[PDB]
């Protein structure tokens with residue numbers, strides 16, 4: 001398809017397109033200062049941290065490197081328990097995402113606590 | 129039974145504001161060194177128009193809340209201000225002018241229009257002055273009560289010489305978004321202005337935009353594709369203006385048919401300005417032509433689009449514009465060194481029920497761009513004659529029982545660019561996702 | 569004609585101020601303070 005090619009597609013169908021989504025991220029050396037040089041300087045900066053802040057988060061979430069990895073925290077079924085075998089390959093990413101959106105903050109702090117706090121101690125506990 | 133599974137690279141976005149930058153089509157200019165639009169020090173466009181279609185997905189836009197308008201309208205003022213800075217300030221120009229008419233025996237419309245004038249201009253030495261004969265226009269001088277005349281600016285603003293090597297030709301500008309972002313595209317024909325475009329697609333970098341300045345009409349712009357398309361925000365309000373896009377252009381010819389002469393006088397140690405010295409031949413009005421029968425056929429398409437959702441059993445009356453400044457009254461445009469003011473009363477004298485044409489045109493010298501009281505640019509005169517040929521694309525109207533008055537409006541330059549940015553919006557890519565699956 | 573501490577404090581003054589035209593000047597009456605002006609030796 002292409003970059004954002006599987007946008008309105010099945011989540012399982014759009015599972016196998018992640019590489020094209022990640023390649024199409026991040027020129028002219030010797031900038032001046034005048035007008036457009038400001039924006040190109042601003043273009044260089046905003047590409048960095050917006051690449052990087054989530055790249056911090058995968059190290060926070062222990063899922064370092066490109067992996068579709070899964071955690072050890074259970075799914076709370078209070079978060080719209082809707083046929084999670086069926087709906088997982090039915091709708092889209094997109095419309096499903098705003099359904100999740102009211103609780104994503106609650107998830108993330110539990111993610112950095114579940115295996116990232118606990119299961120990152122215990123290999124030192126067996127390191128003897 | 130289910131555990132949270134993370135996902136990276138999910139195709140999902142939100143809507144956000146971001147900084148956004150130039151993209152030029154790389155040419156070999158090397159003549160005017162740099163124009164007003166800094167095409168130099170801009171990144172060359174990738175000649176690969178990667179335009180990726182989006183299947184079976186919709187998104188409601190709004191052409192009335194594009195922050196891309198407010199970013200660009202900031203930049204056009206600022207680039208204009210940036211290039212205008214390092215040139216000659218005509219501070220000692222604001223003097224008492226002894227003047228008289230230039231062609232005193234003349235019957236035409238140009239009678240009492242060009243004015244011969246006289247100075248005491250400060251030379252490059254401190255204690256040497258100089259009597260200078262020059263020519264000016266009616267729309268540049270003001271009486272004081274060979275009566276004493278005075279320029280307009282000295283009421284309000286100061287004067288900058290307009291750097292007589294640069295140009296003003298509107299280069300097509302592309303807008304590349306930074307990484308981690310995308311630009312949506314509507315692509316739906318007959319798009320309302322605010323609605324879910326079904327046929328969406330996206331690019332990194334938009335198509336060409338010519339930042340032309342124009343009042344009352346939309347010169348040189350982009351065509352439509354199907355028919356006359358009407359857009360506005362609140363069609364029932366009298367405060368919202370009217371955006372019209374046409375499926376076909378009208379070839380307008382415009383000319384300043386005078387063989388002229390430009391002189392030069394050093395007024396400071398390096399300050400040497402150019403002024404409208406003399407006219408060879410004899411004095412001729414500047415005007416513009418238009419195919420009348422084409423334009424009536426063009427305007428006949430318009431009223432059909434009008435009577436669809438407004439005023440079916442109601443006459444449609446066009447009137448001349450009301451009044452105010454010349455920029456909000458008459459057609460005004462630059463055409464490469466000259467600032468025309470063409471009267472358009474001969475295009476809005478018409479009603480409806482159920483062999484060319486000539487517009488007289490005035491020109492100025494001292495320009496107050498974007499209504500900024502405090503800044504005033506003095507354009508230099510141009511030798512030779514002017515032979516501007518242009519299309520037309522759009523029309524800006526306003527609405528004033530079973531009678532309807534449409535007067536031609538304008539004023540805000542930002543409305544020029546909503547005619548070019550309705551096809552786009554800015555999204556922030558989110559490469560995250562968390563779903564429950566069967567693994568622990 | 570003032571007896572208080574403010575005696576000889578505010579000073580009426582006169583100018584020839586350049587107007588917006590190059591060859592037009594203007595006589596201007598204004599007020600100033602002791603701590604702004606210096607004598608030169610209606611002085």
Ligand SMILES: *[C@@H]1O[C@H](CO)[C@@H](O[C@@H]2O[C@H](CO)[C@@H](O[C@@H]3O[C@H](CO)[C@@H](O)[C@H](O[C@H]4O[C@H](CO)[C@@H](O)[C@H](O)[C@@H]4O[C@H]4O[C@H](CO)[C@@H](O)[C@H](O)[C@@H]4O)[C@@H]3O)[C@H](O)[C@H]2NC(C)=O)[C@H](O)[C@H]1NC(C)=O
Pocket residue numbers: 159160295297298340347348461462463464465510511512513515516517518519
């Ligand atoms: C809408 O689009 C149309 C495109 O179809 C635009 O029409 C074009 O407009 C340009 C500029 O107005 C015009 O170019 C001129 O062509 C002449 C014939 O080839 C050239 O001789 C002339 O070049 C001179 O002027 C330029 C600007 O000053 C200089 O860059 C150039 O070096 C030349 O300058 C020398 O000569 C002059 C003569 O007086 C002298 O004073 C200078 O000092 C210097 O010595 C122009 O480039 C195109 O021909 C037009 N095309 C058509 C088909 O008409 C139209 O302008 C657009 N509408 C609007 C409103 O912009």
Ligand SMILES: *[C@@H]1O[C@H](CO)[C@@H](O[C@@H]2O[C@H](CO)[C@@H](O)[C@H](O)[C@H]2NC(C)=O)[C@H](O)[C@H]1NC(C)=O
Pocket residue numbers: 244245261405406
């Ligand atoms: C503007 O008016 C002045 C009036 O003095 C013109 O100057 C005189 O013009 C005649 C013929 O044109 C000459 O014979 C004189 O020598 C000029 N006087 C001076 C002092 O030079 C001037 O020509 C007019 N401007 C134009 C462009 O015609």
Ligand SMILES: *[C@@H]1O[C@H](CO)[C@@H](O[C@@H]2O[C@H](CO)[C@@H](O)[C@H](O)[C@H]2NC(C)=O)[C@H](O)[C@H]1NC(C)=O
Pocket residue numbers: 320322323360361362363
């Ligand atoms: C085109 O835009 C206009 C507004 O400029 C829409 O008009 C209103 O739309 C809302 C929501 O769709 C309705 O609740 C109103 O009843 C509409 N008013 C009128 C007078 O029509 C219009 O629906 C849009 N049309 C399309 C096809 O999107």
Ligand SMILES: *[C@@H]1O[C@H](CO)[C@@H](O[C@@H]2O[C@H](CO)[C@@H](O)[C@H](O)[C@H]2NC(C)=O)[C@H](O)[C@H]1NC(C)=O
Pocket residue numbers: 348349377518519
């Ligand atoms: C002005 O409009 C004319 C049409 O009236 C344009 O000419 C067409 O341009 C397209 C794109 O290059 C060509 O495919 C057509 O063949 C042209 N038609 C004719 C009759 O020449 C012209 O490009 C427009 N110019 C501007 C500056 O907008």
Ligand SMILES: *[C@@H]1O[C@H](CO)[C@@H](O[C@@H]2O[C@H](CO)[C@@H](O)[C@H](O)[C@H]2NC(C)=O)[C@H](O)[C@H]1NC(C)=O
Pocket residue numbers: 362364365366
């Ligand atoms: C569009 O403008 C019209 C005015 O022409 C608005 O209609 C009136 O608005 C006032 C103030 O909100 C109300 O008191 C009237 O009752 C309205 N009249 C009608 C017939 O509704 C209208 O609200 C505006 N709509 C939008 C979306 O801006």
Ligand SMILES: *[C@@H]1O[C@H](CO)[C@@H](O[C@@H]2O[C@H](CO)[C@@H](O)[C@H](O)[C@H]2NC(C)=O)[C@H](O)[C@H]1NC(C)=O
Pocket residue numbers: 379380381417418419484517
């Ligand atoms: C504007 O002027 C140009 C030339 O000055 C006109 O172009 C000519 O048009 C006629 C008929 O349309 C053709 O037969 C000629 O071959 C054209 N000549 C050139 C050099 O292009 C153009 O038609 C004028 N436009 C209007 C509306 O009058």
Ligand SMILES: *[C@@H]1O[C@H](CO)[C@@H](O[C@@H]2O[C@H](CO)[C@@H](O)[C@H](O)[C@H]2NC(C)=O)[C@H](O)[C@H]1NC(C)=O
Pocket residue numbers: 457458471472473
């Ligand atoms: C454009 O030309 C028309 C030519 O008629 C001007 O209209 C005249 O304006 C004067 C001044 O108000 C009136 O006294 C006349 O009655 C008008 N004529 C008609 C037929 O109505 C018009 O003023 C010009 N445009 C501008 C901006 O001055």
Ligand SMILES: *[C@@H]1O[C@H](CO)[C@@H](O[C@@H]2O[C@H](CO)[C@@H](O)[C@H](O)[C@H]2NC(C)=O)[C@H](O)[C@H]1NC(C)=O
Pocket residue numbers: 580581597
């Ligand atoms: C400053 O002193 C001058 C002295 O001339 C005052 O000017 C005169 O003031 C009287 C009465 O105040 C007027 O009748 C005269 O007409 C003024 N003369 C002129 C030339 O205007 C001036 O008033 C004093 N300043 C203040 C603030 O009182």
Ligand SMILES: *[C@@H]1O[C@H](CO)[C@@H](O)[C@H](O)[C@H]1NC(C)=O
Pocket residue numbers: 076077078079
């Ligand atoms: C799931 O979320 C609800 C709130 O929506 C909360 O009351 C409940 O305790 C959560 N379940 C678990 C197992 O944490």
Ligand SMILES: *[C@@H]1O[C@H](CO)[C@@H](O)[C@H](O)[C@H]1NC(C)=O
Pocket residue numbers: 224225226246247248
């Ligand atoms: C120029 O100066 C001379 C003498 O200073 C004066 O007679 C003449 O009126 C002045 N002309 C203008 C246009 O200022």
Ligand SMILES: *[C@@H]1O[C@H](CO)[C@@H](O)[C@H](O)[C@H]1NC(C)=O
Pocket residue numbers: 270280283
């Ligand atoms: C100065 O500006 C005022 C309004 O701001 C206007 O009425 C007046 O005519 C102007 N004077 C000149 C000489 O342009």
Ligand SMILES: *[C@@H]1O[C@H](CO)[C@@H](O)[C@H](O)[C@H]1NC(C)=O
Pocket residue numbers: 387388408512513
């Ligand atoms: C203008 O006058 C000059 C005088 O030498 C002549 O060479 C030139 O051809 C004229 N141009 C026009 C357009 O008449």
Ligand SMILES: *[C@@H]1O[C@H](CO)[C@@H](O)[C@H](O)[C@H]1NC(C)=O
Pocket residue numbers: 424425428
């Ligand atoms: C324009 O055309 C319409 C019909 O096509 C006609 O009724 C009208 O009189 C025409 N106007 C002019 C000025 O020719």
Ligand SMILES: *[C@@H]1O[C@H](CO)[C@@H](O)[C@H](O)[C@H]1NC(C)=O
Pocket residue numbers: 473477
């Ligand atoms: C409109 O045109 C007619 C003739 O075509 C003329 O008699 C009338 O005065 C014009 N009115 C206006 C407002 O231009």
Ligand SMILES: *[C@@H]1O[C@H](CO)[C@@H](O)[C@H](O)[C@H]1NC(C)=O
Pocket residue numbers: 582583584
């Ligand atoms: C102002 O100028 C006039 C004449 O040039 C002179 O008589 C007067 O003393 C001057 N006053 C001041 C305050 O400079």
